[PDB]
């Protein structure tokens, strides 16, 4: 199906002494493949998937150089933004950046994005056409004018449609054995009783990849949303994901309820019953 490469960057200022904390992570789909942490000893971009280790010393030198350049822009940005918003030196502040590209099932460019936030709020983002900017406020509007004169959007559009897509395809090929594998969820149902009137049914999906999944309950063949609880999809820690959905039902009526699971690793949706 479709694929993505996405980079996530966070810098957090440290008022009293020294530069900000900088953390950078890179993903292909739901697999992290690289990291840089400004607090780590190596001061290098580090591998986090075995298929990226195929890449040579030039890759590591070049990714390290760029990620440190990312870090220094963020450092400059924290001071600039403190100035824009008339803030003091005492408080800690955050900048977050996400960019990347989506490709479809044919592995051709679908979508590119580049967005940026200050203290957890939209600051500025590249629009879908990759030719213009969305500035949330007047500070961001000053940045937009700066970036328009400097033709920033044009440089980003070339990367997002070019290099980004090219290297995603490359990573997808080198990591084929895992990145192009789907892991279907392992499903089961649990039952608990609160009193002698009331039962909880829990439908589990475990060990699945990619993260995207739909779990729903039906009652007598119709969708049931009331008296249900659906948890956030969560990492197992081994690269796979977990989720569950529970429904509260009257004891003895368990049979009316079916759990339905949709995932790309399943050719048709699966049904579970107690």
């Amino acid at each position: 199906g479709s694929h993505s490469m996405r980079y996530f960057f966070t810098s957090v200022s440290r008022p009293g002494r020294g530069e900000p904390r900088f953390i950078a992570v890179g993903y292909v789909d739901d697999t992290q493949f690289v990291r840089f942490d400004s607090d780590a000893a190596s001061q290098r971009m580090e591998p986090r998937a075995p298929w990226i280790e195929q890449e040579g010393p030039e890759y590591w030198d070049g990714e390290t150089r760029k990620v440190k350049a990312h870090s220094q822009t963020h450092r400059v940005d924290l001071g600039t933004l403190r100035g824009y918003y008339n803030q003091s030196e005492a408080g800690s502040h955050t900048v977050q950046r996400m960019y990347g590209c989506d490709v479809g099932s044919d592995w051709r460019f679908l979508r590119g994005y580049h967005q940026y936030a200050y203290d957890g709020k939209d600051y500025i983002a590249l629009k879908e056409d990759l030719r213009s900017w969305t500035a949330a406020d007047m500070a961001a509007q000053t940045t937009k004018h700066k970036w328009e004169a400097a033709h920033v959007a044009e440089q980003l559009r070339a990367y997002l449609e070019g290099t980004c897509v090219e290297w995603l395809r490359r990573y997808l090929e080198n990591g084929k054995e895992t990145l192009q594998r789907t892991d279907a969820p392992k499903t089961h149902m649990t039952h608990h009783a609160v009193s002698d009137h009331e039962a909880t049914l829990r439908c589990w999906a475990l060990s699945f990849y990619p993260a995207e999944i739909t779990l729903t309950w039906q009652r007598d063949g119709e969708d049931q949303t009331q008296d249900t609880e659906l948890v956030e999809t969560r990492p197992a820690g081994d690269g796979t994901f977990q989720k569950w959905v529970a429904v509260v039902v009257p004891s003895g009526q368990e049979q009316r309820y079916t759990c339905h699971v949709q995932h790309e690793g399943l050719p048709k949706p699966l049904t579970l019953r107690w």
């Binding site: 980079y7 760029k66 990620v67 933004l81 970036w147 090219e166």
Partner: peptide, 9 residues
């Protein structure tokens, strides 16, 4: 592969 350049705000 990271973007070659990152403009300041």
């Amino acid at each position: 592969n990271l973007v070659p350049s990152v403009a300041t705000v």
